[PDB]
Design a protein around this ligand. Structure first.
Ligand SMILES: O=C(O)CCCCP(=O)([O-])Oc1ccc([N+](=O)[O-])cc1
Lengths: 217, 214
C-alpha cells in the first residue's frame, strides 16, 4: 500500500552533519508535501518544519531555523532533512508525515556521541548471597559498558520467556550504555536447571553467552 | 507562535471507562486541530482532523469537540488497544505546534513489589568497579522510593534507576536500581542495603548481604 519509507539509523560525532531521507512509496508531487518531527527519548513530539515543493515553500519553527534544512526531490518523491553542527541535544528519533498527517513514517534514530563502538561486558547477577532457596528466586545478567545501542538478550536460546524482564538501557556518565535482564524462577530448580543469558550486540559483532550459577555469594 | 496546553499529562483508567483529554489554544485556531495516537512501538497514526472529523477506519468510540478555547478528544469506552500516548496538533498557522501529550495507562489493584539485592561479581571486581543491583518486581502503582545505605549511611548521587513499560499480562511494573562504587570504596565497607517504600507495603522493606562477591 501507499506509505512513507525512512532511511536507517545514524551514528555521528558532535560537530558533524547528517542528511536523513523519507520516500513516499507510490505517490506524486502533490504528495511530496512533507513534515518532519523530532522526539527525544521519553519526551514529546516537536515540529521541525515542512516542505511544499509545488510552491517551493519551506517553513520551520524558529528554534530550528539555523539547525535544519529541508529539501525535496520531486522526481523520486523524497524529502531530505539536513541537520548541522550536531550536539547531544540532537540525539532523538525523527519522523516524517504527509499532507494533512494522513501517513507517517516509521522513524529514524540519530545518535550523536564522541564514543566509539564497543562491545559489552556481561556479569552474572547470581541468585542468593548465602540463603538456601525460599520459594521464587531471581537471577539475571548485567550487560555493561557498550556502545551504541541496542543489544538483544534472550534466555536459554529462547526457551525461557516466562518471568523475564529486560530493562531499558541507561546512558552512564562515561558515555556508555548499561542494562540488566532478570528472570524469576522456582527456588527448587537452582541446583538442577541450567540458566544462561545470550547477549548479542550487532554493532560490534559481539556474541556472549554467560551461565548464571548459584555461587551462594 | 500558538501554544497548545494539553491536560492531563497522565491518566490511569479501567477498560470500558469513558475518558476525555483536552488541549487549550493560546489563540483562535477556528476548528483547525488534529489528534494523534502513538503506540509503545513508536507507530504514529492520525485519529481526528478538523476538530471532530474521524480518519477513515478509526473506531466510532473516538470523538472530538470544542468548548471555547478548549478542544477535547473523548473515548466513549476504553478498549485494550487504546492504552497509548495521545497528542493534539494545531495547523491554523505556522509554525505547527504540538500539545505536551497524555499517557493513558491501565489501572489495576495495588500490588506490592518482590525485592531482591545482588552483590557484585568477582569478575567485575578485577576491572576496579563494583555494581550493586536492587530489583523491585511486579508492582503497582508505578511510584516507588529506593534508598541505598552503606554501613547504615544513606547514599546519594551514585545510583541509577530503570523501569519497564506496563506489562501486557498483569499490568504491573518492574524497577532496577544500580549503585556504582570503586573497588577501593567497596572494600572499605561491610553492610550494603536497599530500602524500599511503596503504597502496598505497610512499612519499608530492607534487603542486604554483608560480604558477597562471586
Ligand atoms: O488549509 C487547510 O485545509 C489546512 C492545510 C494544512 C495541511 P498541513 O499538512 O500542513 O497540516 C496538518 C498536519 C497534520 C494534521 N493532522 O491531522 O495530523 C492536519 C493538518
Amino acid at each position: 500500500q501507499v506509505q512513507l519509507q525512512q532511511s536507517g539509523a545514524e551514528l555521528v560525532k558532535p560537530g558533524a552533519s547528517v542528511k536523513l531521507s523519507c520516500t513516499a512509496s507510490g505517490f506524486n508531487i502533490k504528495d511530496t508535501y512533507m513534515h518532519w518531527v523530532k522526539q527525544r527519548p521519553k519526551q514529546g513530539l516537536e515540529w521541525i518544519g515542512r516542505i511544499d515543493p509545488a510552491n517551493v515553500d519551506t517553513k520551520y519553527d524558529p528554534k530550528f531555523q539555523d539547525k535544519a534544512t529541508i529539501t525535496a526531490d520531486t522526481s523520486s518523491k523524497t524529502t531530505y532533512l539536513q541537520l548541522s553542527s550536531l550536539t547531544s541535544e540532537d540525539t532523538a528519533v525523527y519522523y516524517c508525515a504527509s499532507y494533512y498527517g494522513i501517513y507517517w513514517g516509521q522513524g529514524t534514530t540519530l545518535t550523536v556521541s564522541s564514543a566509539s563502538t564497543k562491545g559489552p561486558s556481561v556479569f552474572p547477577l547470581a541468585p542468593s548471597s548465602k540463603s538456601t532457596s525460599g520459594g521464587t528466586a531471581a537471577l539475571g545478567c548485567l550487560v555493561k559498558d557498550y556502545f551504541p545501542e541496542p543489544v538483544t538478550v534472550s534466555w536459554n536460546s529462547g526457551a525461557l520467556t516466562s518471568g523475564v524482564h529486560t530493562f531499558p538501557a541507561v546512558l552512564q556518565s562515561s558515555g556508555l550504555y548499561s542494562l540488566s535482564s532478570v528472570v524469576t524462577v522456582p527456588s527448587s530448580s537452582l541446583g538442577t536447571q541450567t540458566y544462561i543469558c545470550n547477549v548479542n550486540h550487532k554493532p560490534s559483532n559481539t556474541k556472549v553467552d554467560k551461565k548464571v550459577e548459584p555461587k551462594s555469594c | 507562535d500558538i501554544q497548545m496546553t494539553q491536560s492531563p499529562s497522565s491518566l490511569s483508567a479501567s477498560l470500558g471507562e469513558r475518558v476525555s483529554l483536552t488541549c487549550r489554544a493560546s489563540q483562535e485556531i477556528n476548528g483547525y486541530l488534529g489528534w494523534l495516537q502513538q503506540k509503545p512501538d513508536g507507530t504514529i497514526k492520525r485519529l481526528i482532523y478538523a476538530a471532530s472529523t474521524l480518519h477513515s477506519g478509526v473506531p466510532k468510540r473516538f470523538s472530538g469537540s470544542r468548548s471555547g478555547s478548549d478542544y477535547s478528544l473523548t473515548i466513549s469506552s476504553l478498549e485494550s488497544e487504546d492504552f497509548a500516548d495521545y497528542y493534539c496538533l494545531q495547523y491554523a498557522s505556522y509554525p505547527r505546534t504540538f500539545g505536551g501529550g497524555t499517557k493513558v495507562e491501565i489501572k489495576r489493584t495495588v500490588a506490592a513489589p518482590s525485592v531482591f539485592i545482588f552483590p557484585p561479581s568477582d569478575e567485575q571486581l578485577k576491572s576496579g568497579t563494583a555494581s550493586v543491583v536492587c530489583l523491585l518486581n511486579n508492582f503497582y502503582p508505578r511510584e516507588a522510593k529506593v534508598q541505598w545505605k552503606v554501613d547504615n549511611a544513606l547514599q546519594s548521587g551514585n545510583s541509577q534507576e530503570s523501569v519497564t513499560e506496563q506489562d501486557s499480562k498483569d499490568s504491573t511494573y518492574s524497577l532496577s536500581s544500580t549503585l556504582t562504587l570503586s573497588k577501593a570504596d567497596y572494600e572499605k565497607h561491610k553492610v550494603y542495603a536497599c530500602e524500599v517504600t511503596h503504597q502496598g507495603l505497610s512499612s519499608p522493606v530492607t534487603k542486604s548481604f554483608n560480604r558477597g562477591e562471586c
